[PDB]
């Protein structure tokens, strides 16, 4: 029950309840998705309808996001209305109704559309494929529900039981008086939650290297590489990603995107080459794997990749900093590879 905050002379506050219940810890496939889609439905005292109608008149909205690790229940509002949104978020965590008809009429539709939006963007099909082959059953669990194994209303309830506990969440208010926030959290249903355990395991996730998958796809072709990083060797890969996505690198206009996904215990580096035809995708990645295999750096972005890693303001609550003014060199060891699209015209792992 870590209750953070930070005041300011502004007018918009934003409460936020982070909860360790993303796809990482998921008993059945997509159940974290369904639960995230179930937030802000009916509680036992307040209907989804009344919540919206009330918050609108006050001047604030709700929103529930899904990560590979976090389910975050956020609330954005006018400053002096704090207690209401604290108790609203409290209500949801403690006592959402989970009516069978809410499942069929609101949650399953909303999830089906989520899966559909993602089913048609081939970098996301790739990113999911990258996770599933590196970490074979941890962070490589499916992000979204697609119905490959049954998930009943009970499974969604059981999972809410595990994940919504005092030990497994952190309240976090931006633009809030810490005094009143802590005061309001302890005086609510938050402090009356069961506090089971947290599944933030310190042990490095076991990832398998030199893995590749090929998915046939009608649309744009995309070839992607993904590299497992260390708990400490991650801040160099961060400058790598920001180097590859900058005018310093000559091969920045040869890729679509490159990023490092930072977690609580390691991370994953991703690189995305995407274009219409398979010829331009083959070349632009065959070059990258050859150019980074004989890699370089010389800390050129060391202040720029510190600029970019700082302008992520929300981050603060931010991990390791001065690891940039440390290592500046980069090789390119073994990685993981996925070809999505015109597959009979894309590189295999052999020839990179």
């Amino acid at each position: 029950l870590t209750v953070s905050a930070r005041d300011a002379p502004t007018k918009i506050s934003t409460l936020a309840v982070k909860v360790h219940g993303g796809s990482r810890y998921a008993t059945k496939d997509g159940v974290a998705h369904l639960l995230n889609r179930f937030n802000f439905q009916n509680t036992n005292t307040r209907s989804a309808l009344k919540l919206v109608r009330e918050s609108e008149l006050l001047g604030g909205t709700f929103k529930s996001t899904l990560d590979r690790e976090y389910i975050t229940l956020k609330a954005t509002f006018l400053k002096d209305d704090l207690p209401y949104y604290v108790n609203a978020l409290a209500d949801v965590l403690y006592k959402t109704a989970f009516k069978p008809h809410e499942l069929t009429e609101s949650v399953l539709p909303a999830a089906r559309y989520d899966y559909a939006v993602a089913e048609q963007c081939p970098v996301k099909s790739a990113e999911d494929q990258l996770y599933a082959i590196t970490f074979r059953k941890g962070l490589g669990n499916p992000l979204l529900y697609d119905g490959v194994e049954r998930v009943s209303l009970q499974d969604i309830k059981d999972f809410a039981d595990k994940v919504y506990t005092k030990e497994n969440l952190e309240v976090s208010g931006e633009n809030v008086v810490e005094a009143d926030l802590k005061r309001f959290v302890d005086e609510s249903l938050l402090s009356t939650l069961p506090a089971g355990k947290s599944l933030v395991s310190k042990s490095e996730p076991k990832f398998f290297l030199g893995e590749e998958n090929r998915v046939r796809f009608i649309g744009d072709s995309v070839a992607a590489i993904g590299i497992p990083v260390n708990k400490a060797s991650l801040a160099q890969y961060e400058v790598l990603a920001n180097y590859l996505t900058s005018a310093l690198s000559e091969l920045s206009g040869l890729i679509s995107s490159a990023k490092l996904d930072k977690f609580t215990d390691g991370g994953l580096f991703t690189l995305f080459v995407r274009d219409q035809d398979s010829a331009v995708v083959s070349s632009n990645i065959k070059k990258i794997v050859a150019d980074l295999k004989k890699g370089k750096d010389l800390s050129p972005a060391i202040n720029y990749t510190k600029l970019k890693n700082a302008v992520q303001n929300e981050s603060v609550s931010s991990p390791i900093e001065l690891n940039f003014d440390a290592v500046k060199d980069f090789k390119l060891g073994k990685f993981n590879y996925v070809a999505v699209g015109d597959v009979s015209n894309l590189p295999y792992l052999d020839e990179l």
Partner: protein, 125 residues
């Protein structure tokens, strides 16, 4: 007349043991004279369904009750058209004549009443 209103009046009678002992026997005898149980129907099968509350309610009925209502209704029409009643061993017994659709109806009426309330809320400064 809404089922919320029938439930209000009915529950008031059912609790107060003055009325409860006076009326329920009258009501029990009314239900037997009605005769719908001899056709194999439960009362809730008889509710007029051509309105949004009842369509919401029937939509929310679990599969197995839905298939059962369908059979009871079809069986009632066939018996009606032959100008017979069912064999007595096929009649609905009082233990079976449960308000199975009532909770779905009451739930839908409350949801509807709240929307009507919220669409028309006044504000005071």
């Amino acid at each position: 007349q809404s089922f919320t209103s029938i439930a209000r009046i009915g529950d008031y009678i059912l609790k107060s043991p003055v009325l409860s002992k006076l009326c329920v026997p009258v009501a029990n005898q009314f239900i037997n004279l009605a005769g719908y149980k001899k056709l194999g129907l439960k009362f809730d099968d008889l509710i007029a369904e051509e309105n949004p509350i009842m369509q919401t309610a029937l939509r929310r009925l679990p599969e197995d009750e839905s298939y059962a209502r369908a059979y009871r209704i079809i069986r009632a029409h066939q018996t009606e058209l032959t100008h017979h009643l069912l064999p007595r061993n096929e009649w609905i017994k009082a233990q079976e004549d449960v308000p199975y659709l009532l909770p779905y109806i009451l739930e839908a009426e409350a949801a509807a009443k709240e929307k009507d309330e919220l669409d028309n809320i006044e504000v005071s400064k």
